[PDB]
Amino acid sequence: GSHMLYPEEILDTHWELWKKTHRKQYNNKVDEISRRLIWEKNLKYISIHNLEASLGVHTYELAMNHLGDMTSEEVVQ
């Protein structure tokens, strides 16, 4: 009871850049940190999906986009 998973330092610049391109603003530090973790989880999802696609599991790849900091559940929450 003290943690879980953490933002990866290597993506700090990419996160800053992603926020600018998609015109993202966050109410406060907690909000931003939470959304960064969703975004990192989504990146991992995309990478593994695309790894699968390279192995013929899927006929299509995925890509990070402007919805990147949201969960699946939030398609029409």
Place this chain on the structure above:
Amino acid sequence: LYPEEILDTHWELWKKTHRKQYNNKVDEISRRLIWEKNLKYISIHNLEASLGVHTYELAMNHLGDMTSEEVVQKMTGLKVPSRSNDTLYIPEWRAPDSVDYRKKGYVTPVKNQGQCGSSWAFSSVGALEGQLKKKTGKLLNLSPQNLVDCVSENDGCGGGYMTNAFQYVQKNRGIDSEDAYPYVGQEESCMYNPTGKAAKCRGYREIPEGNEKALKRAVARVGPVSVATDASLTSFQFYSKGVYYDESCNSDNLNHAVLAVGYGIQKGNKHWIIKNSWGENWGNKGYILMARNKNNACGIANLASFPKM
């Protein structure tokens, strides 16, 4: 039969707007007379419609100087084919009263196949575009030329059918975008390697033949569905608006492939929303509403399938 001089200026304007050219005066005159006959047909048919004889209107369009047989010969391309359990669509039985995937962002712009028998490829591509949107959130134009050139079980601009196309995409693990592999309206050599694998899976499901209720369920549940029709009638060639229904349409004379992107009812006439590939100057900005639940009119549910992979 001479042309009607009162239309001379309208003929010139029609030629200019549709980029029409003729090899010689004799051809031009023959084409003008076909156009004037089509115009008279359109006029009388619309008079009959104003009297309740028909549920749809006709209008002149870029096909006006062609006969109906010529349109089928040059700009359709469906060749009819083998129905087994492993490709059979099995619904999971309340569908909405109406569906329109255009409004959900699942349907790309209307395309123009030109004088190439490639409607099978445009139909396949539209269904694939819908499923790609469903799985990724992105709408992209996919490549009919990829299919025309590379589906060796089909015949390019001389025709084909959609499940062969879906099977190709399954074996190939995908299809190119239109940007990467653009449409040229004639068959060329495939950009890629001969097709590998012996097909691990079929890659598509088929609607039980003639079953409009299963087709509705599939449109509601899956997305846009590839379908075939009889497009050999002049009333189809000049369809403009309303719900199309012509008792001379022959469900055993399938010759053209299109895309069911929805269904609904308009002014009490139930319909399928059908995307054509004759450009936007045909029908209603490229679309036709075709009668639904009128005994499988035009064979709309006889050759229906969608990709699944």
